[PDB]
């Protein structure tokens with residue numbers, strides 16, 4: 001009869017068939033991941049082609065229902081999600097060219113192998129050949145050689161490809177009534193039609209700058225401390241007034257600073273909180289790790305794992321004969337099928353990763369009552385943030401003492417809390433200016449503010465201005481230095497880590513206020529608190545049915561992303577860094593004073 | 597059978613032992629409406645209607661008087677004044693295959709809700725719009741029956757459940773489906789209270 005009932009019936013014949021086809025495709029991807037064999041690759045490709053053709057046919061059929069004659073907000077949200085053209089608005093030749101460009105960037109990134117000139121008989125791939133060198137070497141020219149040679153090969157291969165990529169993506173985005181591809185990425189946070197809780201695509205950049213301006217003093221003090229410690233480690237290369245050399249940050253790109261914890265430790269004489277030996281002495285299997293994680297999630301009041309989870313997950317490396325991807329991934333296959341694919345070792349990192357991926361599984365289970373096209377996070381930040389809050393809570397010494405992994409007579413003094421907070425800042429705070437600079441650079445590239453002949457002169461200028469990292473030697477326009485990273489070369493949004501980092505501490509403050517924790521925020525554990533789990537599950541059950549602003553009102557009581565919980569989390573460390581930086585100079589100079 | 601084409605078996609002129617069903621450990625749901633299981637083995641009924649079908653795990657709750665859903669409106673409707681028992685059990689072992697068992701269907705769309713104890717096996721294309729379907733599943737004209745995709749790796753809310761609904765009615769005809777009355781060991785040569793065939 002009416003247009004709304006027609007759209008509801010169409011959405012039901014979408015949903016029902018979609019859940020089952022997404023299941024078939026996801027199961028084919030799972031069978032590829034647990035069994036790397038060519039027929040499984042062919043079955044995965046066939047299922048993916050069927051899934052993409054079915055999405056094409058439903059997008060072709062959904063557009064015939066006009067949006068303004070539908071008043072129900074959820075139906076309008078699903079119709080808005082379905083009616084996106086994607087690449088279908090672009091011509092078939094240009095769509096094929098874009099797909100070919102994406103595939104050849106995937107092959108160049110995956111099979112990129114670089115080694116020293118005049119010694120070409122064997123070479124090292126990025127993982128794990130170059131990762132271990134970047135994370136463990138203490139030699140200046142070896143790290144400089146690896147960094148410059150990998151950015152030479154990868155950038156000189158990828159620069160014309162990226163120049164074609166930006167033009168094709170801008171053409172697709174302006175064909176979809178967007179200003180640029182950056183506006184297309186910012187449209188994920190766009191909320192329209194809700195009174196008061198509306199969020200605009202242009203408000204996202206302003207909110208990111210407003211939060212980063214408050215990030216900046218803490219990052220300046222952390223950068224000054226890391227600069228002083230790297231000056232102690234490397235005597236002559238680092239200047240007191242200038243930026244850090246790029247190849248000394250402990251990772252390939254500067255994404256994380258967590259590999260500098262050994263060099264920049266405050267109190268080496270004091271012990272660590274490493275619990276690995278305690279699990280080795282008590283012979284803790286990975287099954288026991290996941291059962292302890294399940295005990296953590298039932299302690300907060302969330303539902304426990306299904307029987308099919310324990311039956312169908314692969315929590316151990318299969319063997320030599322059978323090949324599997326080692327990366328930990330939580331799979332929501334559909335229809336109540338939840339699995340974790342992780343090659344779990346007996347380490348603290350794998351235990352925290354198990355908590356993180358079981359948080360992903362809990363988030364996926366929570367919106368199982370929702371319709372299929374609403375089965376997502378409210379934005380891309382919440383989905384990772386609900387795993388990162390479990391990674392925060394599980395890492396506390398109170399949680400380790402509660403599960404018996406730590407000695408009950410372990411002395412928790414201020415020095416261990418300071419060095420733990422410094423490690424968490426090197427992991428968490430250090431990625432924020434790199435993420436903001438990369439996303440702002442990509443937004444200016446898509447917007448056309450930066451011409452193609454001036455990409456790198458601005459980029460290093462941004463890195464000195466924002467990240468406080470100087471190039472070792474100047475780079476011309478034959479280089480493509482951003483696209484050596486996985487997410488930018490393979491068409492992935494990068495602001496999800498920034499939003500995840502802020503939502504992580506916002507959720508942490510909300511649950512710790514719910515749990516009535518009376519101490520420091522980093523000393524807070526959300527176990528044993530039913531009300532904190534209920535406050536979490538109220539947002540978790542919504543999924544994508546409600547706006548992320550309304551979900552954030554439901555959790556923290558605020559209508560916008562906030563920066564104050566992060567500063568409250570690191571406030572003891574902030575005071576300690578301000579005390580330690582009295583003699584040294586906070587801040588950096590954008591000039592070429594260390595080396596160029 | 598499928599829930600749109602649920603099998604109905606009329607049970608008459610025999611002895612119905614309900615304690616075999618009630619004391620079995622193989623059933624997950626044994627919810628009786630309008631009668632209690634303890635007096636089933638005593639009472640007597642004119643006829644027993646045994647409706648059998650397969651549904652999902654989350655749809656077992658809809659087999660009840662006064663419920664609302666796809667199964668209640670479009671597949672199998674129970675009256676509010678229903679006397680009988682709903683017995684359901686998990687059948688993931690039998691009714692699920694690794695490739696996917698698509699032999700089970702469910703009417704997804706109908707113009708009006710079903711009457712109680714009605715069977716709809718029509719395969720006519722549902723008309724959601726003003727345009728005539730003309731027998732082709734085009735725009736706004738959808739096929740009514742949609743398949744279930746049973747697999748053994750499914751969640752407990754999606755695993756197949758075999759449901760048998762027994763309907764007990766009393767009509768003015770003589771009730772012949774009675775329970776098995778027991779027989780206390782005969783004692784002779786003593787002053788006892790005897791009950792022989794009523």
Ligand SMILES: *[C@@H]1O[C@H](CO)[C@@H](O)[C@H](O)[C@H]1NC(C)=O
Nearest residue numbers: 031034035036037318322323
């Ligand atoms: C993985 O694939 C090989 C290919 O022959 C097969 O023999 C093996 O049974 C498979 N293993 C699993 C767990 O599916």
Ligand SMILES: *[C@@H]1O[C@H](CO)[C@@H](O)[C@H](O)[C@H]1NC(C)=O
Nearest residue numbers: 008011071072073074075371
């Ligand atoms: C919108 O549709 C859903 C079903 O798709 C329904 O449950 C909900 O009540 C509707 N909301 C309004 C305001 O009509």
Ligand SMILES: *[C@@H]1O[C@H](CO)[C@@H](O)[C@H](O)[C@H]1NC(C)=O
Nearest residue numbers: 063083084085088089176177
């Ligand atoms: C998708 O593309 C078609 C054809 O160019 C166009 O008519 C339609 O409006 C587009 N969809 C949206 C949401 O703009």
Ligand SMILES: *[C@@H]1O[C@H](CO)[C@@H](O)[C@H](O)[C@H]1NC(C)=O
Nearest residue numbers: 298303304305306307308310
């Ligand atoms: C989850 O918890 C319920 C109730 O506490 C329990 O009956 C069930 O066995 C648990 N699931 C698993 C897989 O242990």
Ligand SMILES: *[C@@H]1O[C@H](CO)[C@@H](O)[C@H](O)[C@H]1NC(C)=O
Nearest residue numbers: 413414415418572575576579
């Ligand atoms: C830790 O506490 C001791 C004792 O109160 C004090 O002497 C020391 O300065 C403190 N250190 C820091 C970093 O707060």
Ligand SMILES: *[C@@H]1O[C@H](CO)[C@@H](O)[C@H](O)[C@H]1NC(C)=O
Nearest residue numbers: 299398399402403525527528
């Ligand atoms: C949380 O509850 C469990 C259940 O008794 C208990 O063993 C554990 O010690 C509690 N946590 C804390 C921090 O006391």
